[model samples]
Structures are given as C-alpha cells and as structure tokens.
Target: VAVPMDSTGPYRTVSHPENAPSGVDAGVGPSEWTHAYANPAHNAAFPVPDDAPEWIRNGVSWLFPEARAWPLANPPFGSGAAEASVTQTQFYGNALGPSVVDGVVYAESDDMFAYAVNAKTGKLIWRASPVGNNLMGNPLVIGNTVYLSAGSVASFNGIYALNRSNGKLLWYFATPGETMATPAYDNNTLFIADGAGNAFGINATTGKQVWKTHVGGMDNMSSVTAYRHNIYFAMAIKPYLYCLNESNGHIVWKGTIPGASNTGIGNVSPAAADGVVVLDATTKMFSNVIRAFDAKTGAVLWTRNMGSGFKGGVPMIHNNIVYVGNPVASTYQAYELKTGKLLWTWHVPTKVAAGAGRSAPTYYKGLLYITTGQYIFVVNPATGKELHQHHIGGQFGIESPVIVGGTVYLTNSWDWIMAIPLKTI
Candidate 1:
C-alpha cells in the first residue's frame, strides 16, 4: 500500500443525496459533482480487497448510467445556487474538489458551496454555503472534519478547517497567496502549497503552522506526498522536484526535471512507490512527458516524451507497474516500476482533439481506471488492453478518478457525481 493513504478512493458525486433538502439545498435539476482526489498536495486512495470477484477483474461488467456513484442529486437540491450569499467571489468561477469519509461523499460547486451525500446509496444528507467560493483542490478528510483551500490569490485566500459532519467552520488559516494544491497529512501535520510559491506544515487538529518552506511559485491543485520521514513533490513556478524532511522544513535534495520548463507554469503532480517518483510531466501549461526519479536520492531514472499529453495527469503505482494516461494523444500507457521500461500503450477508442484533458488514473483490484472528456475506462494493467468504457453524459471536465471499496466515484463540473460497481457482485 501507499503507507497512510491507499490509492483508489477519489472525490466526486453526481448530485445531492436522496434525503430531504434543508436550507442549504438550492440549485435545480440533477447536479453534477464529478471529481476525484487529484493535486500533488493531497493524498487519498482506496484499497481494493485482494479477493475481489471476476467481473470486477475483467471489467466494469457492472457499469450503469444512474450516476451510480453513491446516489447524489435526487428529488430537489440539484444544486446550491448560493453564489450571491457568500461574502467573497474571488475565484468564484473556480470550484474546489471532493471528499469521501465515513459513508458520506462531500463536494463543492462553482463558488465553494459544499454538499454531503451517502456513499452506499445516492442520497442527500445536507448542504451548506460553508465559505466564500473559489476552491481549487479536493477537501482533506481526517476524522469528522474536512479541510479546504482558497484556489485563487484573490479575496479569502486561506485554508479552511471545517467539521466534516456539518458545514461549521472550525478554523481558517489565512495561508498566503492562492492555493490550488490539496493538503497532505503526515502523523498529525498537514502540508499545503500556494500560488506565490510556498509550502506549509500545519497541525492537523489545531490548524496551526508547524513549519513553512518557500518553494518556487505554486498555484495548481497538484498535491504533495508524505513518505516515511520525507515528503516529495514538484512545484509550479520553477518546475523542480523537491524532497523535504517531513518533520522539519529541510530539503534533503532538489533536482531539475529534464525536458521540463525552467520557467513559466511547470509540471504535473508526482506519484511514488518502491523508491521512485512517477510523473507525466506537463510543460509550459499543458504538455506531456513521462519520467521517474529516485525517491531516496534525487536522481533521474528514465524519461519519455509523448509529444503532447494531458494536464493534471499524475500517475499511480500498483503491482510493480505505473499506469498513466494522455487523452489528448488518446493514449494510455504502463511502465515497469524499477526499470522505467515502457511496458504497453492503449489508445482510447473515442479521442477528442477539441476536448481537454486526461485525468489522473485510478487502479482497482485488477483494472486501471482512467478518464477523458466524455468517458471512464477500465483497462488491464498487465496488458494495456481496453476492457470496458463508460460514457459520461456531459460536456465538461472530470477531476482525478478515485476508488473506494471497489466502487469508483466521479465528479464533473457540469454532470453529476456518481458511483459505479466494478462488477455484478
């Protein structure tokens, strides 16, 4: 496993739950809450049981269109059009990501409006205006509380610590600059990044800063990873991979990513396993390049240029292999863990050149889950063969794909958040 955080669980629900609407419920029609655990700053993944059934192993033999992801958006409360009620509308157009804790899945909308729904069955539990909108990454869930960041450098540029059970604000950290990176947790401390170039270590329970480090300029929702006594990540501004001491703000080593932009917006988030960090580098703003680095020491292992790829394309390591996708190139690929050898590549059946991105992929019991502008697919990690594909009914973007208990949760900015069974079981 990936130490404290497993790999499959993500953010995104189709809509509000089936429960009766309270004052928090607003918006009409079926709401779309399609998002997952993305960002180098956040770490949240679900572990599939070793004994999962065959249909699940073969494909999404159990796919559906009910927005099966935990049954969100029912009856009323299709959305919460509370844009006018909030105090600040800075990145009001920039919606944050999602959170799944307990049996509930939590998410936000265009202005940082928060929603809660059932994980087992698509049902609404409650809704809250929470704070002013303009959120960037997924909410960090630790126990009955949730944490959020201000996605822009505009008004209310802070980190919010809220009660996960409700929308009550517990504490808010006026973190400097705009934050798109989700916060990572180690022991009891939370790590975060910002637009003006900074990373922070905050007490998980108290929302207090433990230590602060000035990295390059960082503003994207990509997150940081905490491993053993160290944390590994790539910042936006200078595009350098940084390895820092998890206990104190100390750099173990830092290195320049080859083929990466030295200036301008940098690269995608990083994924590590078996002593390596994996990334399909995003150059300039939106471009693709795959590479590996030694987690223990900052050393280059291997690198591959896909000509062009997708943005927000972090990678995942499973069963000694790394699976990454580039919907722009209409390609999904796998590589050997230690050797960084190109193992296989699969082309998406429906490629949208005009379409946007390929979200970070999700791996389940025996299949790799990847998303595109209009679909989610299941592929054999060992063979790079497409086994099944689910067409999402919409015209927007999907956050990273997150898996929880064998069920994949998706959130699109426009469609609805949904849950799907890996198989008939």
Candidate 2:
C-alpha cells in the first residue's frame, strides 16, 4: 500500500517485506564503500582494509612475486593478457556490480533480488526480494541500511531502503520520476535524478524527499555523485552538467559542453575531487573530449580532446590525478586533475575491438586495477606500468571492481560474480 508524504514530497511504502529472507551474522563494522565508485566523489580508490595481510599492510608494492599461476591450456575466448587466471568464482544471481560495507558486499540484480556476500569468503549471507521490479545500479550501503534503485516499469521506478543485515524492507520511496541511476548520499541525504528532468534529495533514514529540483534531462545510467556540499550529474539528451546544493537542491551552477546534439554526453557519470569536477562527452562529428571544471564556480578548467572513442567510462580521481578509460581507443589513462595534462596511457594489448576499457579503474593502496575485455590488469598508479594481468573470461560491462578485505569483487554480464584474492596477484 502507498503512503502519503510529509514535508518531504514522495510517497513511501513497503514492498513485500513478509517475503524477505533472514540474514546470517554478517558482522557489521565501520568500513564502508557506500557509493558505486567507493564514495560520493566517485573516485573508486579505497584505503587498505583492517583485515589486510602483513605484506599489504606493510606497503609491499611488488605483486605476483612468483610465477605460480594455474596454467591455461586453452586461453579462454577474449583472454589476451598473459598469466591471467581466476582465484575463486561465485555466481550469486545476476548484477551490474556490488558495493561493500564493513565485511559484507551488497548487490542488486535485474531479477529483483538483493544479495549480501561475505567479502572474504564470497558466500551468501542473505538474499531478499523486497521489490518486484527489476533493479539497476550498485546498492549504496550507509551505516546499516542499503539504498537501491529500481525501474523496469513506470510504477516500479523508485528507491528501496533495506536493512543491511537482514535484507528487510525498511521503506520504499516512490520517486517523482524514473530514478534508474544510483542515488548519492551526503550529510544524511540521498540525492538522485530521474528521466523526468528532476533531482530529489531524500532523507537517508526516513525515506522521504527533503527537496526536489527540475535539473533537466537525466539518463538512466548517469549516476549521481556528491562532493563537498554539492551534488553533480549530467543530462543524457543534452550537453549539460549540473551542480546543485545538497541541503536544499538549489542550482549552484550548470556547465555546458560544445558538441553534437545527440551523441554521447551523459552516459558517463562525473567524478569530483581536489576542487575540480571531471567528466567526458562525445560528439559524433567532434569525436570525444574529457573536460574538467572548477567544482565551486563551474568554470571550465581544462578540456582534452580524446581523439577517438564511442564513449568513455566514468572518470575516477585521486591525489590530484584523474584516471579514465576510452572504449574505442582501447586505452586507460591518467592525467593531472588540475591542469588536465596527460600523465600516462596504458593501452590494451589485445586486438579485441570493443568492450576494452569500458570498465572503470579501481585504485587501492598504491596499485590501480582495471578490467578490459576478459582480462583484469593491475597497474602501478604512479608509473602506469602493467604489473600483472588475469583472464577471468566473462563479458565485462560498465561495472567497476570493488576491493575490500584484500579481495577484488567483480560482476559480469554473464550473470556471475567472482572474487579474486589480492595475494594471487
């Protein structure tokens, strides 16, 4: 049954909580990867977990010390890099990807089920179907709650808040528009955008909308990212990027990109850090370009024409450096976040055409990890050197890898989730 809104203007309800499953003792802690890209800034870099091994804790940078790897008699299809092998494989219903909190990994799948897995064991802690609609985007874990977006049908398009430990339906807030993208959280508020050209800030705890602003056209995949006291997102149909006040949903600034009318503009999400917001856009005629803008003033900082690519994955920033991957170009690059100066480019060695560089890179400790085609390449973030590569043999999608407890959690389009030990590298 639907419930009316209070001061926050969105209907609140519950979706089949009676059918929810019980959760095991997942052991919650303070560690969290609340956003799809680690945090609201979408940086994708994570600090070393408390359970890290002594080698990792001691800052031992060298990986794959020995050539001990399972010999691949027949290289899997699309496997290009050398010495690539899986450590452990687990198939938990299908999902776009996962977000980790404490020691538990959370994911939502198209099958309308939410899953919690042990980050260390890759075993299921709980699985529940709180909503009947198909789910999209990574589950955001804040404190003890999981916030997820669903939109297979018009009526089913909204956000669901679930109990992190038990997968119980805490509340479901039906959005004013189709909110297919993941909602960004900051200051106890959840910011999300819908296809109806509206952005809403909902109370993270109460499942109520605090404010809503019509920011214009937002794509289903243009996941929202929050930085400082502002929220950032892009328009799918136009070359417009928006920054709004996190507290009141007021427009702080709007950035415009000069490009073709309808190519690739907002399919890629924006990542902000070090007082700058970075995003990528593509025009059928002008090709592609990655632009950086002053996070506060929305002034254009720098724009780099990325020569070629159908589009690029969501850009990640860390320590004044921006890391991004271009699909058609088949290259993952690092750049100076302030000046937009090109630092280094690591090109995929395989002859595979598409899918290469489609996934975002994850920076953990001092190493950078990215998935291209079916291979996961480990790179030295400082030098852009390929330290190691592993072949997992699955159709990689827009999903980014999540590193927690020394294990890399990954999701593929083939309806599989796999865990690889960092020591195996």
Candidate 3:
C-alpha cells in the first residue's frame, strides 16, 4: 500500500516501499540491491526489517548524515545496526539549485534557508538561515564553499558564501534592492542581477564588489548564463537582450527583438544553449513569443510567436530542444533549438482540467515532466506522447515540477510540498 504524506495539496503516496523493504531488512534482497530509489522519504513512516544491506544503509546515510547517530545507535527497532535504503528530497521552486557534483545535491528554498541534504537519506547535514523571510537564489557550489543570493521583502538583498560542509556563512555583499536571479560564477568572479535593473560582479571568495553596471532598464528574472566569457540576460519592457563581459559587468553587445515590444507585463527569464540565448517575451495582453539571440554578439537568431502570456516560467533547453508552457492557453510546446522550428505541441485541455498559473516543464531522462495546477503529466520528448498523467488533487498555485533522482517535487500555494515517484515510468 502507498503511504500518504502531505495533507493539503494532492494526495501523493509513496510508491513501491515493499519492493525494497524498510527498517532493518531494507535493501537486503537482491531486487533492492540494484534498483535505485527515488525520494524514499515518502516512505519514512513505513516499517522495515532487520539485516538490511550495507549499500542501502550507506545510501540512507548519505541523504541525512546527521541522522546517522540515531539510526545507527537504535536502528529504528530492536534490530541493531541494520541498514535502511533511502532517497532524498530538496526544495527548489523559484530558483535553480546547485548542480549535482560528485555525489552531492545542493539547493535553496524561499524559507530563508539553504541546505545540503544528503542525496540518499532525507537528513540535512548542514543548513544556513541567512535572514528571516529571505528568498534564497540558486546555490552555486564550487570546491568547498557554496555561493547564493539572498533577498528579503524588507529591502535586504545580497550575495552570500557558506561553507558547504557545515553551513557557516563566510562572507556577504549587500545590494540596493531585492534579488531573484541566481548568482552566475565564471573564473573567480560571481555575477548577479537584481530587480533594480543593475548587475554586479564580485570576488567569489571575499564577496568584494568588482564592478557594478546598469545593463539596461529591465529587471532580470533568470540567472545570467555565461558561455565563452560572455554573459547574457534580458531587461523588462525594453524587449532587448544584453551581452556582457564576464570579466566585468560591461556591455559587450546588445540587440533588440524586431517586431517585439514590451507588453508591460511581468519580466521573463532567459536560458542559453548551443551558442544561443532564448528569451520568452510574455505580456498580460499579447501572445507570448520565444526569441533566440546569438550568445556572444546578442544578435537575433529566431523568434517564434506562442499564444498567450507566461507569467514567470523559465524556458528550459535540453538536447537541442527548447520546452515552454503557456498558462493562458493551458498548453505546452517544444521547438527545435538550431532551426527555430516547432517540433510538437500538446495542449492541456481546459475542459479536462485547470492548472494554477504559469509552471515550467522539466526534461529528464528523455521524458518531459510538467505540472498544470494540480495535475502532473510526463511525456516522451521525441514523440510528445503522454506517458503518464496524475492528478495531485490539491491546488498548486504556480509551482513548477522539480526532478531529482527519479522523483518529482512540487508545492501548492497552501505551503505543502509533495513528492511523487516516477518508478512506474
């Protein structure tokens, strides 16, 4: 039987707990030995047997290293020293997380918290709360320290560095306004953009300001992307893309999207891939358009008009393909990256269901994962065929799908986070 976790949103249940066992004998059998688990915390409340395998125990230990002593000492039962197979879940909604390196999964949450959760068990090894109510940006981990952007509604915004092992704040640099963009790191410098239409370059280690330049009069939504020493970002209302020098916050090139003007709507983020930077021009009144620009020179590559407006969803690029969703039309579309051709289109019929707001789709392991309000659907990237569809049952207000391991993480407006297993796929 599947176990239920979150109460407010969709009634998500843990999948296949019995297959791997739990408690003590968990991970003992051969089946559990090889099959990798995804988000095992959903089964945290389940029972397990004694004499679990060492690898399962090690995996669990890796997820929540801090919980090692308790589980090791007591073993969750009279079964002493038994291993438990485990999976981990990290929080990421409005921003990206530190990319998985070696065996670590790093991420930040709006709860004013940044943490390094064990990738095996759900245990948190280190956590940092920079400020109360500050929405932390995507964490960038390099070597021993992790860098991030922390911003508060009370006018506190800055770049921060923390020791990855123990979550100690090393240094920070304050900015003039709130920041939502993730910090971009190249060479030894860190670049960050804020709501005030300004970008800054800082020394990654010391948090000392290197240079600050007003790229344009637009608020940056997504983290800046760097390729070949060039930085690319978009400005709100101007319908222009700015290319900057990675060494300094100076403009290297700038280009305007012809036939595209600002619709005075919310800002859109930019994504870069294959020497091209894609921008989603969305407005409350006009249809959304996906504009691709030359990464180094900021020249317009191609522009394809999509229907309706996207509030704040960031376009994703994978395998030379760009995927985006239109909330107003309740549709998700994919395009070829190099030639700007529509590959395929799938519409989430409004008569069938309604999603909360603009939520982006995630591509993983040849499948596209998307959440429309309370429903989550997985589609084959090449065929656009529906692989599986599920209704989470709660009103997810504009939360996007985040895939870690083989499970998907999503939250509702009611502040509830749910973990769904993709094992069936």
> Residue by residue across 94-118, what tens digits does model 1's lDDT show?
2233565555566654455555666
Give each model's whole-structure lDDT. 0.57, 0.68, 0.53
Clashes of 3: 15
lDDT of 2 by residue, 73-122 (tens): 33333343321211111122233567766656667766556777655545
Q: Score candidate 2 by lDDT.
A: 0.68
Model 3 regions more than 4 Å off: 1-104, 152-154, 237-239, 257-266, 309-312, 349-357, 393-420
Question: Candidate 2 clashing pairs?
Answer: 64-425, 84-390, 84-391
State each model's C-alpha RMSD to the native: 9.8, 8.1, 13.0
List the candidates' TM-scores in order.
0.76, 0.81, 0.71
Candidate 3 yields a Cα-based lDDT of: 0.53
Question: Distance (Å) between predicted and true CA of 389, model 1?
Answer: 1.7
Which consecutive 10 residues in model 1 have the weakest lDDT in total? Answer: 26-35
**Per-structure clash totals for the candidates:** 43, 3, 15
| Residue 57 local lDDT, model 3 | 29
